[model samples]
Target: TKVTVVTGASRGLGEAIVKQILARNADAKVVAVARSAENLQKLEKGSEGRVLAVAGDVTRPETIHRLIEETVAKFGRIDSVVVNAGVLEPVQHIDSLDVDLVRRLYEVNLFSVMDLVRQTLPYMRQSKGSYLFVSSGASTKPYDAWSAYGSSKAALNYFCLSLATEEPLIRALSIAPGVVDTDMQQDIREVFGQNMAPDALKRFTDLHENKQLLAPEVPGGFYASLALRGVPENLNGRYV
Candidate 1:
């Protein structure tokens, strides 16, 4: 049997994606990675042996090695990896700066992503599979006061593009799961007076006030739609 690995799979889109994928393809297991063992245990229970909860910090190299080893040991092989674990740091301009916060963001978003890809490449070489980065719409379309988060995703975008060009053997996609409702908005609420980042803010308000935020199912389905089946050839590198 084969398994897919999803970081941050303890909650939100990650959790939803794990549920959706395993529900449809029980044969393909999911190695759900998160800092919280307790939360991941819930997914393991719901799906029985379909979930392998790998508890570790992304910044640590040794932990990543353990995750890969355990997945292979249990599931036989890993078909794909979703680098979904990340922090949503409130973006203030470089001038008004929280330099340490920015550094931490890079560590989680860019550095760890690169390291994970490097570690996972050998396995992917065997499978001819993909590495999915949960990028943001902010990657291409910038917004005010989005320094930390936007820059990290933009780096992710370039990283994916560069990687795809370099490693033709493995498909690397920076998935822009546009504006589905998630708790990251709560952090944004703290940063931008609860009304800033208008698009995200509106999505938050709509989900709460008018209930217009797209269901988690839609984006989760879209992710599964792309990963298992080949995405449209025409869609190629642009946002899907």
Candidate 2:
């Protein structure tokens, strides 16, 4: 059985990816992270006790350290880690954007992911593990009120690309899951509707109302496949 770590495992694509991985490989064990203790416990319950819920903030190095230590203690080796926990809040134009919230955005979306990469690299090298970052298309595309989130993710993309080359032993890839129907998207739509450009608001609103958002299961399966099956070496470092 392979051991996997997942942040933001309480909901959305993170939750979906956790379920699909276990479904495809019942022997797989998961070390799940999320601030919500209750939701993380629910995931544990539903996984038939295969998940270890680490309830804490990803921004805290102590939290990540605990997750890593416990994973090795329980499972012996980590096979992959999906960096999925993120926030999409304080959404507003740069003139009105909250600098504090921007800092938090980088903390969760960019810095924490890098923390995981550095902390887990040695163990991953031992096990030939993979590091997967749940990046965003917004990282490449510009949105009126999304500069902070977009740029943070862009930086993470760069980190993954560099990690791929620098540590050729393990696989590292930052992936854009497209627009999935999730609580995060709901928040994105609400905030943008009130504070962003009219066209940006309309874009998300129409996507929701028209049922154009992809289900989490769609990308969830692909993410699991990348770890459970395998990722081609050539594709490492690219945003797919």
Candidate 3:
């Protein structure tokens, strides 16, 4: 049986990805992580033996190690890993953005995921596994009030390239999940309760108002393919 690990597995795209992966395969085992203990417990109860819910924040080293430790203890090996937990906050213009906010975003968005990769690399090497990072369009495109979030994701993509170069046995991918309807969008729509660039705030709200937002399932399915079927070798380290 293949063992897959996914962070932020409690809700939104993360939750959707877990569901699709299980629906697509019966023998596959999932190690799901999230900050919501209740949601994680609920997922485990409903998933039969296919899901193991680990409730914790990925930013903590103990949490990252625990996810790896517990997964290996139960499944023996990891076939795929998805660093999916993330936060978007302090959406302010570049000049007005807090230096600390940028650091915080980097810690959660980039460093935490890197830590997960670092800890899971050995197992992935043994299993010849694939690693997926949930990325964003803002990472590539410049968007006002997105300095912190965009930079972290951009760094994430670069890290994926580095990982691919250093590890021949593993496949690394940073994927831009297009505009999806989720609470993250709600945060943007409301400007995250912080003063933000008017254009940036309006842009996302317009998408929702115009019904142009992609459903979580859209990215969920694409992400599941990367985790379950694996990315094409030529595209390894490539941001898609």
- TM-score of every candidate: 0.90, 0.97, 0.96
Per-residue CA lDDT of model 2 for 1-240, tens digit only, reads 888898999899999999889989979988899999999988888888789889999889999899888888888888888888998776778899899999988888888887877898888898788888898988899988888888888898999899988998899888999889999888877655688888888888899999999999899998887777656788888887
List the candidate 1 regions with Cα displacement exceeding 4 Å: 190-208, 230-239
Show model 2 residue runs off by greater than 4 Å. Answer: none
In the order shown, the candidates' Cα RMSDs to the true structure are: 2.3, 1.1, 1.2
As for lDDT, the candidate ahead, 1 or 2, is 2
Superpose all Cα atoms of candidate 3 onto the true structure and report the RMSD in Å to 1 decimal.
Answer: 1.2
Q: For model 3, how does the per-residue alpha-carbon lDDT over 1-240 read when each residue is reduced to its tens digit?
A: 888898899989999899989988888999999899999999999999899999988889999888888888888889998888898886777778898877887888988887888899999999889999889888988787777888888889999999999999999998988989989998877647356666667777889999999888888988887788987899999998
Please give the lDDT score for candidate 1. 0.77
**C-alpha local distance difference test of each model:** 0.77, 0.87, 0.87
Q: What's the TM for model 2?
A: 0.97
Highest-lDDT candidate: 3
Q: Using lDDT, rank the candidates from best to worst.
A: 3, 2, 1
Residue 177 of candidate 2: its Cα lDDT? 93
Greater-TM-score candidate between 1 and 2: 2
Instruction: Give the alpha carbon lDDT tens digit for every residue of 1-240 in model 1.
Output: 557888988888888888888866757788999888899888888887888888888888887899989988888777778778888765665567688888998988899888888888888878877777889888777666776888889988888878777877777777878766777755655456342557756645565556665667778876765556543444444444
Error of 1 at 179 (Å): 1.1
lDDT of 2 at 208: 90
State the lDDT at 240 in candidate 2: 79
